[PDB]
């Protein structure tokens, strides 16, 4: 009984390792970028050129 | 005539000054309205995120 139980335990151990430890390879992607504001400072242009 | 001359010149200068002022102020009001609307869209984005 112990042998059969430990067989399944060891079999699932490696699967759990691969599933979980490999998550630590990267988890910062949740972090978003700046997305800064202007605060009425980027108003320094007239209606001179618009195509470029 | 000279009196009319000075009157005409002064009225013309005043008119051009008022026109320039109101035009630049119109540009300013455009810019501030853009500020308001774009900020409102940010508000909508934030509302959706929080909900």
Swiss-Prot record, chain A:
Keyword RNA-binding: no
Keyword vocabulary terms for this entry: Acetylation, Actin-binding, Muscle protein, Phosphoprotein
GO MF annotations in UniProt: actin filament binding; calcium channel inhibitor activity; calcium-dependent protein binding; protein domain specific binding; protein kinase binding; troponin C binding; troponin T binding
Residues bearing PTM Phosphoserine: 8, 41
A biological-process GO annotation: muscle filament sliding
GO cellular component, one term: cardiac myofibril
Post-translational modification: Phosphorylation by STK4/MST1 alters its binding affinity to TNNC1 (cardiac Tn-C) and TNNT2 (cardiac Tn-T).
Keyword Transcription regulation in record: no
Function field: Troponin I is the inhibitory subunit of troponin, the thin filament regulatory complex which confers calcium-sensitivity to striated muscle actomyosin ATPase activity.
Family that this chain belongs to: Belongs to the troponin I family.
Assembly and binders: Interacts with TRIM63. Binds to actin and tropomyosin. Interacts with STK4/MST1.
Protein name per UniProt: Troponin I, cardiac muscle
Species for this entry: Mus musculus
Name of the gene encoding the protein in the UniProt record: Tnni3
Complete-protein stretch covered: 160 to 211 of 211
From Swiss-Prot, chain B:
Other information: The sequences of cardiac and skeletal muscles are identical.
Induction: Induced in stimulated quiescent cells.
Protein name per UniProt: Tropomyosin alpha-1 chain
Oligomer and partners: Homodimer. Heterodimer of an alpha (TPM1, TPM3 or TPM4) and a beta (TPM2) chain. Interacts with HRG (via the HRR domain); the interaction contributes to the antiangiogenic properties of the histidine/proline-rich region (HRR) of HRG. Interacts (via N-terminus) with LMOD2 (via N-terminus) and TMOD1 (via N-terminus).
Domain comment in the entry: The molecule is in a coiled coil structure that is formed by 2 polypeptide chains. The sequence exhibits a prominent seven-residues periodicity.
Role description: Binds to actin filaments in muscle and non-muscle cells. Plays a central role, in association with the troponin complex, in the calcium dependent regulation of vertebrate striated muscle contraction. Smooth muscle contraction is regulated by interaction with caldesmon. In non-muscle cells is implicated in stabilizing cytoskeleton actin filaments.
Family: Belongs to the tropomyosin family.
Highest rank taxon of the organism: Eukaryota
Localization, UniProt: Cytoplasm, Cytoskeleton
Name of the gene: Tpm1
């Amino acid at each position: 009984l112990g042998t059969r139980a430990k067989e399944s335990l060891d079999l699932r151990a490696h699967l759990k390792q691969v599933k979980k430890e490999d998550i630590e390879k990267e988890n910062r992607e949740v972090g978003d970028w700046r997305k800064n504001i202007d605060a009425l400072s980027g108003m320094e242009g007239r209606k001179k050129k618009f195509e470029g | 005539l000279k009196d009319a001359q000075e009157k005409l010149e002064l009225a013309e200068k005043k008119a051009t000054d008022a026109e320039a002022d109101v035009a630049s102020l119109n540009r300013r009001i455009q810019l501030v309205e853009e500020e308001l609307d774009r900020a409102q869209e940010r508000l909508a984005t934030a509302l959706q995120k929080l909900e």
